[PDB]
Amino acid sequence: RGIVRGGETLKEHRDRLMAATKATGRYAGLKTLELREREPILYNKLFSRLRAGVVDARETAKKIAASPIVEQEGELCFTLYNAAGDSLLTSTGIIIHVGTMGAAIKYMIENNWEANPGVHDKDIFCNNDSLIGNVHPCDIHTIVPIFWEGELIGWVGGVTHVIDTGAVGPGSMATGQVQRFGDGYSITCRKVGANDTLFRDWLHESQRMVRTTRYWMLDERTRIAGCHMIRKLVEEVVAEEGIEA
Amino acid sequence: RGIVRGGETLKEHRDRLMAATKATGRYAGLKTLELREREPILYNKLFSRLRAGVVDARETAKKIAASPIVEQEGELCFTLYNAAGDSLLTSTGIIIHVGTMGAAIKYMIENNWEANPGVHDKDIFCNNDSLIGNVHPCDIHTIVPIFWEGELIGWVGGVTHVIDTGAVGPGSMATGQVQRFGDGYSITCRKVGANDTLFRDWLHESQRMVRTTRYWMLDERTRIAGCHMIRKLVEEVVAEEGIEAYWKFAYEAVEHGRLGLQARIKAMTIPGTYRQVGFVDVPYAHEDVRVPSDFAKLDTIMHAPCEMTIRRDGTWRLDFEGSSRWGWHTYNAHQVSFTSGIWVMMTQTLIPSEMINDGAAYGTEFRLPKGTWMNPDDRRVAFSYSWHFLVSAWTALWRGLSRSYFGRGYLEEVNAGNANTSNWLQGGGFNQYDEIHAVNSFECAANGTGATAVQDGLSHAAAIWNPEGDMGDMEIWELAEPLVYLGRQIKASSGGSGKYRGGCGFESLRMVWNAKDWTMFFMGNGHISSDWGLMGGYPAASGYRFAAHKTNLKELIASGAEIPLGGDTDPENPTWDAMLPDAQIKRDKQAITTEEMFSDYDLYLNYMRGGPGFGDPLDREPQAVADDINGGYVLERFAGEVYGVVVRKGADGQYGVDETATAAARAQIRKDRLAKSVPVSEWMKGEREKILAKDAGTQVRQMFAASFKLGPRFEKDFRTFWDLPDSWTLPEEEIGVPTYGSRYSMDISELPDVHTVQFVEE
Amino acid sequence: AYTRSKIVDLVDGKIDPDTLHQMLSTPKDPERFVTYVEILQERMPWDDKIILPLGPKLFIVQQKVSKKWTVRCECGHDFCDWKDNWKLHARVHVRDTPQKMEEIYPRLMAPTPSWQVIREYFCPECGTLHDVEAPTPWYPVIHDFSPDIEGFYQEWLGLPVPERA
């Protein structure tokens, strides 16, 4: 049985949606929008609550950080995705990562992360790999799947620009290296936690591959906070308005 | 409930064993060995089956690999550990990793891996982190726990040297980077699999962080095969002989090892104090060292003095007070790799017929002051070519031990020391299969060995890190490098002169062929020979570079013109250079470089070093000098000047000895030596004047200044020896070179939740 | 035990490969030291008693009349008291120029003398070369070995210490 709600695998689900997009010229083959057209009050209520949720995650979680880049300048973003990795709503801030974090989710879909290492409720993924679409290594993604009654119904992504990733040059926009080798600590959709808990091998390794260790650590707690705030809000919205809507 | 058999946690178990070791002086407090003493037949059967198992894992699993470094040369090792991370038995091969993999297990123990991420049956761990003790990033460890009836009873470790780990420089022993940042993909005791299955996120990530992906993948399958072969064998042995007997052996075998070292020291050596030193060069000022950080651009020298004490009770102690500081290069080390290499040396001389495991480490005391290059105190240091310093410090310890052997009459055991293990031919770009690639030749697995008190050293034979030397087949290296051989020759006049001559090295001439977008570089000792001769013998020859660009060889080959082939027989009187009138030739002492563009038909000389000599060359058997000239071991012109032997070419083309003229030449050289020398007091007076005037190059002054700050006992010794006034001082800042890291440093143990394991006095 | 003949062949560098391998690969003969020193004693042109060999032609000896212990060359020359460094009383030749290095190595294979020098230490009577150091400029003369002779004789060999003034 596939993990997406209804029993499709992640890849089966996305492939069906992309084929209908191509055949009809409308996203997912949606010729009409039933909820929007027939239930406009409920459509607007979901919009209002979920957009406020993502905005609030950015505004609140940034107070965790030690780095002024995140805490004062607001160079962070939180985004809500459907099961196929397409974004529904986002905070403002560094919103280029609406696309980069969705493309990372789609890489997991297309390369059968579902069968190994598995995508489980309360897992934590981390990613920054520019070979699968990211801007640069200093923009670190934390990605958490969202489940309802044992099936996957979406994902949430959070990004922070960190001060450094241990490239040859000391800075975010570094010079010195001329290739990937020396361009910084590069993480490819790694499972870095389970049961809402970060793995110690990840913690020890990551922290010694950068210069600005303490700043790195608090940027990570910033991303996990906002991801979990949004997961909780989605669970509440579904409980109150029903999964079908 | 803790996971170790009996219910202790990993940390509780190890702490109990270390406390008993400290209180009693015996490993684990074992005052008697019950299994060994009361059940000798069963003890020997476990020894035989398990030692054969680890030997078989190495011999069999290496046939998986695509890289000739693993498959032909055998640069891999498999080791069986008890629950506390102490080794019981090992295969041969790169056995420095007996210590590095045990220290990685002890890091997991000490940092509560048991609680997170957990240590479960059928887990797979991977590790290469030099901050917790490894040699360098290219030595990759796979570590698997061993369980019996749901509790942990041991571990198995397997290591392979891989071609590259995606450092700035393309090779294993890379230059270009000056810090951890760019020193290669570094993995800290990562859980990379469970239920005997590797995780896909690990597979995708690891494979794109290296150049030599396919070679990397098969080296990984090599390590997992051997680990699982050994796990299965341990399960069978326990099933057949019972867990109680195995559980006794797993600690008794270590104490048996310690007892073996103590007995060998008392049988072979002499109690006393032995003093010796080694050095090597770091010529980073040269324009062909293109490093990206200006604070790294300077010439320095490694300093490694050692005070060795052998006690009446058969214990011994090695103290490296006075050593130089870590630096901005790839030659730094760690207390674990430094002391594990001394253990490797011990296996080749003191304990080859005893138990080969961690017991001998428990029988040795080490002092490595914190902040020296062998025990650094800064988490930014680079390690890719750790060996440059390591092999240059260990060679002096052979000389100390050999004085004990010589004094006692065990002349068969004397050895003047190990060669510097270099050059390392390296480079990268596109290969003959049109794929991204890197090369790292293991021809310098086969260097000269030190002379003995009874016979000459062996030429092109071994390395300190693996005594089973192998140069590989030319036809096999040609499958793994876009290069072709134009020569392979014994290296004349490389072995250190003496009554007994050190082993010669060898050399190969390469032409670039079927490469695209290609670079190469050199790495080895240049200005300084690290080894010294013993009791009158001389050091081996030092290093140099030969490379040629824009050679025009395509047209020279086609036109029937003379072409360079063989070795660079006499680099003072070369023949190749005149054959290449249009080439850009680099022929100089710069034995360290960063990557430079090469094209098809360009040339590169790979030169492997010789080993040190023994005794006064004036006592060498004259026929052995003539044999050496005829055999290509020694150039003719040194027979007279070095050995006092007069040779002449006979009708058959062979050199023969003039015995009368040789006796006269040797009598005359004795008089020459008296006439040209001075009393040591007189020479000391003149050298002291230069010290007072600060008359030496910046590289010499920086070495003393840095050594003085880390080693006040050494500064006191130097001042006393040279009778220097208190008004004379040598601060590093007055030299005029960069001194970043001389005062400010931050150790890995300063980061949150990091607990380091202590193995030495510091 | 090995025969006296085989230990003679070992000292001369003429030992056969089977005996040499046996010596290397089996537990040591405790009798080696006493036989070794007796063989060396018989070759010396003086009758003062060897206490410990330091090199092929260099020894700690007991003076026949005074019973002091000195470092001595095979030719008979006494350098100093056994606790002092014999090198401080020797003659030295220092190779600290490229010409001097090129007498004993080819150019390019030679060490560079502003980084490493070669220091040759001779007996002042016969010109025997007893040691070659290869350190940096400015490096102290090395005191190679201070043996615990009392401990060696009494505790490891089970022999009394020879008479000493």
Add this chain to the structure above:
Amino acid sequence: RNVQVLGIDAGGTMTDTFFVDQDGDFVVGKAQSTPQNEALGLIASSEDGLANWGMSLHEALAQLQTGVYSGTAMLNRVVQRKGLKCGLIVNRGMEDFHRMGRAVQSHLGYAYEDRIHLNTHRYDPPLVPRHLTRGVVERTDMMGTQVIPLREDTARDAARDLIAADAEGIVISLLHSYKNPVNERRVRDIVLEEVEKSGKKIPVFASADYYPVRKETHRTNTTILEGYAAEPSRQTLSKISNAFKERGTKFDFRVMATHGGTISWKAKELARTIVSGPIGGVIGAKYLGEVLGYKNIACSDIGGTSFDVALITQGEMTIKNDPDMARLVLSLPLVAMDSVGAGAGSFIRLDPYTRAIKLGPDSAGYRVGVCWKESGIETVTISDCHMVLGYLNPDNFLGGAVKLDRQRSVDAIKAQIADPLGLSVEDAAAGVIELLDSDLRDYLRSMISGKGYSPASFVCFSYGGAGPVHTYGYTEGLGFEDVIVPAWAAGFSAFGCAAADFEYRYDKSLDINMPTETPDTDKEKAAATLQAAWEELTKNVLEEFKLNGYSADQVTLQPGYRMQYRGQLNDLEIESPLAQAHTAADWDQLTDAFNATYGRVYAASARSPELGYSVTGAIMRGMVPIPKPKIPKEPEEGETPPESAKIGTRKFYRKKRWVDAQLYHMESLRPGNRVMGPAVIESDATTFVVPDGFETWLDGHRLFHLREV
């Protein structure tokens, strides 16, 4: 009696034959070897063996279905370093590669302890000295592309240099000639032209014509042995084949090869049979071990010239590609064994300067020693020490057919060894035997320790004519589980040749490369390529069985292939689950069978299917049934030998004491019997020595068990 199988062990001091009838009953023959023409001693050995059944050579030879030759003539040239004087032509600039020994030759054949103990490492002199080596200017790359065209004038000058240096054979080995042999074969043709102008008889050996496989060190050593060790035996097999056909045989001789299977006597590449004799011994040991339940066996054999050792572990011989033997890297696939120059004919000499005793490595061979007055041997041998000490009977050497004189051994040992050392004659001879026992003991121990074992994990089998003469000495204190001397020790290698399956095997290389998933057409094409090789190799196998009078319906065929993951340097031999291959599904079945075997050889987690597959070769074997030798199974009688088994006493010297050793006739002893040392148990072609401090007992399988007391 209907006699069906003949096995042979030639080239030693004594030639042994082993005959098996339709019921599995056997007899063993012996005669003196005749190295000028081995057939003469072989016929005499055959008549001696068949006389035990009251049968003539004429009667039996007509009935034989197969015969397998083995011997030591070629091996003896290797271990003594007494071969044809070969020169070597390689690439200019790489003349040194042979003598460098790839470094690895300084530590081959060593114990675990000696591998790490650096000062024990040592190079033996090269097969071809540097002054008999020259180089031609040429380079061909790994693809077969010419980088540097052959300069033919340099090939001519190389040839003339080696002819003027009096080379008796010339070997040619150029880099990657196995891939593109054009340049190496042109150098061969030019060398042949210069030899023709010289008028001298100098055979030429190009590596590509004999051993066309990668690794120049391995290939060049092997091609050298073809000239150095094999060439002087080139005509032996055709002389044997003719002598036997004249006397009525109808089968085609087979010969035991390095890999433990047999090949045709017509093989061009003779070094494939360089250890035929010792390999026959291992096959024998494996068969005996299977019948009686011995899984871990340390094989050990002394003859006139060599001591051979091999390990069987968990019932398997371990066949190694690119092996080593006699401290030489080689290209012949080899069951794990080794051999050294130490035997009962080894010469004893004093070093002129040190007076050290030196044993071998050369031997008197069939000439025995000074004790055989008609030999013309002047230098004492180990056999002369056996005479002095009472190890062997002067009056029962080859059953009394060769008369030995102990007084000649006494006089010669006195003049050559004892008087110069200041020793009595018996102390000089005893000292020689102490050195031998210790050398052999260390060699056996080292083979076991090189695999990581202790001797306690093994049972030792001791065989060959001279094996039982020194078993007491070379196993002393090693702690073997048991130590076993078969009563048929002298014919043990001939026994193994007779117990070999009647099998012919042919191989062919291939180059099929396949991604993990490919369309069906690619799989069909791969299958067809393999099928075509199987059809060709099937003709070669069946043609050989036809020459032995077996038609195709009597032969059982077993196809095989060599497979690996792409990019690997090594492959695995897989037995095909299909008799033929055609479909895409067939190809998938062959790749599945490889993955499963790889999991068993290594581990399940080592499999790497994501890299794809390469098939590197095809194999076909064919078999027909023959009777195996029946191992005796008699019931035990008492502990006391019958009085009629005693045949006198002889003065016997060991550890500074003369004793009266009790002599027994081996074949008169009964199952159950125990014999306490000092004793000598004598047959007509072997002698089992049991000194004071040892004891033996005989089982129902005609195996003696040796113990320390």
